Amino acid sequence: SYDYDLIIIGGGSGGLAAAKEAAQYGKKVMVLDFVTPTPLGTRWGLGGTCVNVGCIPKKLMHQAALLGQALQDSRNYGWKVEETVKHDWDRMIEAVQNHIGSLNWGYRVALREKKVVYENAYGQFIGPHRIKATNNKGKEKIYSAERFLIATGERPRYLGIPGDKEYCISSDDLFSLPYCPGKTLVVGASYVALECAGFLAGIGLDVTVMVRSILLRGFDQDMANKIGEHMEEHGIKFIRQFVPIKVEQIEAGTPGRLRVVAQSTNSEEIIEGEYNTVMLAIGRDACTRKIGLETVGVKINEKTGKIPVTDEEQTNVPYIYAIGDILEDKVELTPVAIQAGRLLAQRLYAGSTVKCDYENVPTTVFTPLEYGACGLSEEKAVEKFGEENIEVYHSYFWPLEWTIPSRDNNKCYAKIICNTKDNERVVGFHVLGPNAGEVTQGFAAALKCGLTKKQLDSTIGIHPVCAEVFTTLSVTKRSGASIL
Amino acid sequence: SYDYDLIIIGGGSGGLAAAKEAAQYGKKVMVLDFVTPTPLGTRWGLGGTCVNVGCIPKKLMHQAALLGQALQDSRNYGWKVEETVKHDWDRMIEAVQNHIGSLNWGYRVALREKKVVYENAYGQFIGPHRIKATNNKGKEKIYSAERFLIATGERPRYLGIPGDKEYCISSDDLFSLPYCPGKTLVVGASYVALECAGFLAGIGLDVTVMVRSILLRGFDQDMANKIGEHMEEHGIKFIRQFVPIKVEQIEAGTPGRLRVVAQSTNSEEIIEGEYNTVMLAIGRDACTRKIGLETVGVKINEKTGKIPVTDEEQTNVPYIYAIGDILEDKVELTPVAIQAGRLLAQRLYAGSTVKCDYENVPTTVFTPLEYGACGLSEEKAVEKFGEENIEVYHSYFWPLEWTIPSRDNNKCYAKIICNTKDNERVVGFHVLGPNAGEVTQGFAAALKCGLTKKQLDSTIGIHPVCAEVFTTLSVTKRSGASILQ
Ligand SMILES: Cc1cc2nc3c(=O)[nH]c(=O)nc-3n(C[C@H](O)[C@H](O)[C@H](O)COP(=O)(O)OP(=O)(O)OC[C@H]3O[C@@H](n4cnc5c(N)ncnc54)[C@H](O)[C@@H]3O)c2cc1C
Ligand SMILES: Cc1cc2nc3c(=O)[nH]c(=O)nc-3n(C[C@H](O)[C@H](O)[C@H](O)COP(=O)(O)OP(=O)(O)OC[C@H]3O[C@@H](n4cnc5c(N)ncnc54)[C@H](O)[C@@H]3O)c2cc1C
Ligand SMILES: NC(=O)c1ccc[n+]([C@@H]2O[C@H](COP(=O)([O-])OP(=O)(O)OC[C@H]3O[C@@H](n4cnc5c(N)ncnc54)[C@H](OP(=O)(O)O)[C@@H]3O)[C@@H](O)[C@H]2O)c1
Ligand SMILES: NC(=O)c1ccc[n+]([C@@H]2O[C@H](COP(=O)([O-])OP(=O)(O)OC[C@H]3O[C@@H](n4cnc5c(N)ncnc54)[C@H](OP(=O)(O)O)[C@@H]3O)[C@@H](O)[C@H]2O)c1
């Protein structure tokens, strides 16, 4: 009957994971992926947001910046390095792009290998079980399939103000900028804004972050506020409670000069500044509006763009499933998308009954001083169980490696959130320090095991590594005792 | 009435932990700590092995060598740095000793603050409840207490071959060495041996390792072999199955020149080589022989020197307890010493009833490429549960940060051992890669919770970080499938 057993719209994290898992059980699978250019014309290869314009490029630039701090730290350890080393933007972009290009290609090869058909075409539903796919030259073809999986990701959102689409860049553009950004204004104050500002400042640039309200809305504000302070102390300038209303080009160039006009969120005062680059990092929009979901009856939430699904990634229309950043009320991260994609396939074609668990998924914000978390923030814990039933254990720490260079004492921070009414179940894990991701992974598998403060107390730390701090936390926030 | 509620012999990791924990509950406490010099005369302050000649200086040196790699790596990320940077041994040592100084002082101040009496004197039992203390000038005093705690640690072991104590250095000396070691020979093949060899190589010295039998005896041999290959593929030279028999001084200096003569372990072959420094890292001896244990009746293991003890750190003599390295069949690690000390005090003075858990204690070998482990090695597991009931999941992995420098793909390696007869519980965890301590700590807490492979699979990884590799292991050793990248 149908052309394919399964057609996947979108070839990023979720989509490709699902493709390969499906092909393994002998299914006839087709993957559609197309990358609509950026206002400025930026486009990229197979792989999704993470491979081309997210995790991978972000992490590598994070490292270019960390290596800069490494150069400095090397002097007090004996390395005869100059006091000021220069960084080359072009050289860096070329390296990051070579690596990205290698993954574009590897993905392509992995599909050919697993017998998955790849079509570099934009897909959209035209009627029950059928879809139109349009390539770059506009040529079209229609395909049918027993089931469909929607995995289209999202894209950088805009402000809708004069000059935005014309002179600004977003995360889609940054990772391949053909010239050094120069003085930079980054607008927004969550994951993307802070990580990007963080690495831009780390390789030597003049960076300013314009915040509308608070930093990292949704995360523990105690932790967010310390991430903010660390960035301030370390270079990045902030403009608080202001939003840009107009961006104008004082002059074109590589880079040129730009004029940004901003207004208070609680006053009528207005300000203005001059920057070489203005990056917008104010959110991302689900790519669910233009794929013909009406022609096949899939309901979304027309307010947010997200597709509500069952706890098996099934939408209202039964033969159509969705995974990834587009889901409503889930977790927007690469490994979550991969897990959903692999399990989905396993439940469809391998008789599995295991579902993806979106609870206590750990994350790490790659700011100059990394932030790792899993579970509840303190705010959300007090709320869910009651202040009277929450005990918070915390402590500053100083990475051994920092003592010789003699910097940042008592800037790193660890805290766990315990539920008194439940044998002190560790409901929240937060860490601000080097290698936060490496430190958090294992604790996340311990929260899945029901870790209790008692069990944690009885785990012996490894000396001398940062993670050990969690092994001996004794001061509570309630007790009022200092931890400085 | 005795002079003190408790006297601690040893002001290192276990001793100082228990001291502070016991002074917490208002008991009168005294801590005796003395550092008898090395054959070459090296001595140091309060703190113990870790502080002055172990963990701390070791890791800091491991770091000087990681930074060397960071400088190399920095070029492809765009930093304009020289293809080759020179390293100053003096600046490095002077920096490490300035930090050790701080800790010595800090530790003294902590003792003062908790109202703990500190005698920089050598201690030994003389009769029931009584002890003699000798300071540096020979002046002695006698003290009594209701209870005693032995926490004396150990000291580098020597070979007993011509020239060893005369011309060789041990970890006690390396960390304060007043001159760059130059071409170096490291005898031994475990923790100290590989870590030290690893970092002298990392700062640019010619380094060689002489190995009697196998590497890291006791550890997983698959992991051990790989740590080996990594070191070999990254400079470090190995001489296998030989043992030195004579060290002689071709010429004194700073450094001088030495000739080492060694002999095969399975033939009559004999070889010789010239080195500037020869470091012995062949073990450590419990400091339990000269503390007057007979005058008070504490029974030890005459062979090993390790004090046997109850699951409460209590010796044969009721009011005499022991913690730390000297214990027999426990875990010779700083954090374990600390746990025992603190908990011992809690049980004595605070009604606690919690004993120190010596099972599945984690550890990390800080070699050039780090190795973290917790639980059972593969061999150890197969033994205990039967080969037919062990499923091993494993994989190579390539840190994202290494792709741009374009180096060492397929070198890092991860592996877990599951017991199939027990819901595939994770009985063993091993990882060879960067920041292996940071990656291992949390998983050690998961093993404490009875982590099962199924729960591990249900844990979502953090991307892109190395530990995420444990999140998605699907290839079993039994299956035969390849695990390359
Ligand atoms: C700057 C940045 C940094 C990030 N860092 C991290 C991190 O460190 N760790 C982490 O876990 N997550 C990170 N994320 C989030 C991560 O990128 C997403 O969670 C992940 O990419 C989601 O995968 P996906 O499949 O759901 O969507 P995507 O990966 O974006 O895949 C969607 C693909 O579908 C294509 N597509 C869309 N519509 C169509 C259509 N109609 N036809 C054909 N193809 C179509 C798209 O062009 C895209 O290539 C980051 C995101 C950004 C933006
Ligand atoms: C090179 C090296 C690196 C190491 N690295 C690590 C690591 O990374 N992580 C880790 O967990 N462990 C490490 N260890 C092991 C760790 O240092 C020990 O496990 C720990 O120090 C044991 O503490 P302790 O109190 O039991 O004995 P110690 O800490 O050694 O304290 C014993 C003290 O007692 C003193 N003393 C002895 N006899 C007397 C006496 N009669 N009177 C007065 N004082 C006396 C000694 O001089 C010494 O200062 C390392 C060891 C070495 C040698
Ligand atoms: N390391 C990682 O794992 C990682 C890193 C980066 C991105 N990501 C993924 O990418 C997603 C998108 O991140 P994002 O940071 O772009 O957005 P986000 O998480 O939705 O945050 C939007 C940010 O922009 C601000 N903002 C919104 N509208 C604004 C306006 N008109 N003017 C000024 N500021 C405005 C918000 O402030 P208010 O508080 O005022 O709303 C907030 O700081 C993440 O949520 C995550 O799923 C993951
Ligand atoms: N990272 C950490 O936590 C860490 C780091 C360093 C030290 N430590 C602590 O310090 C303890 C002692 O360390 P260690 O490495 O010195 O000793 P060890 O663990 O006892 O191992 C001794 C090593 O020396 C070899 N050897 C013994 N006698 C020899 C001889 N006559 N000639 C040549 N080689 C000989 C052994 O080989 P065989 O196999 O033939 O015996 C073995 O490789 C550890 O067990 C640990 O408690 C911990």
Swiss-Prot record, chain A:
The UniProt PTM text for this protein says:
ISGylated.
Return the broad EC class: oxidoreductase
Q: What is its EC number?
A: 1.8.1.9, 1.11.1.2
Q: Name one GO molecular function term.
A: thioredoxin-disulfide reductase (NADPH) activity
Keywords in alphabetical order: Acetylation, Cytoplasm, Disulfide bond, Electron transport, FAD, Flavoprotein, NADP, Nucleus, Oxidoreductase, Phosphoprotein, Redox-active center, Selenocysteine, Transport, Ubl conjugation
Record-listed N6-succinyllysine modification sites? K59
An example GO BP is: mesoderm formation
Which coenzymes or cofactors are required?
Answer: FAD
The SS bond pairs are: C50-C55
Q: Which reaction does it catalyse?
A: [thioredoxin]-dithiol + NADP(+) = [thioredoxin]-disulfide + NADPH + H(+); H2O2 + NADPH + H(+) = NADP(+) + 2 H2O
Q: Specify which residues bind NADP(+) according to the UniProt entry for this protein.
A: 157, 189-195, 212-213, 217-219, 283-284, 306, 332
The record's comment on cofactor binding reads: Binds 1 FAD per subunit.
Task: List Phosphotyrosine occurrences by residue.
Answer: Y122
Sorted alphabetically, the Gene Ontology cellular component annotations on this record are: cytoplasm; cytosol; extracellular exosome; fibrillar center; mitochondrion; nucleoplasm
Q: Where is the active site?
A: H463 (proton acceptor)
Annotated positions binding FAD: 13-14, 33-34, 49-50, 54-58, 122-123, 152, 191, 325, 332-334, 463
The miscellaneous comment for this protein is:
The thioredoxin reductase active site is a redox-active disulfide bond. The selenocysteine residue is also essential for catalytic activity.
Role noted for this protein: Reduces disulfideprotein thioredoxin (Trx) to its dithiol-containing form. Homodimeric flavoprotein involved in the regulation of cellular redox reactions, growth and differentiation. Contains a selenocysteine residue at the C-terminal active site that is essential for catalysis. Also has reductase activity on hydrogen peroxide (H2O2).
Q: What family does this chain come from, according to its entry?
A: Belongs to the class-I pyridine nucleotide-disulfide oxidoreductase family.
Quaternary data: Homodimer. Interacts with HERC5.
Q: What is this protein called?
A: Thioredoxin reductase 1, cytoplasmic
The organism is Homo sapiens
What taxonomic lineage is listed for the species of origin? Eukaryota, Metazoa, Chordata, Craniata, Vertebrata
Q: Which residues of the full protein are shown?
A: 160 to 643 of 649
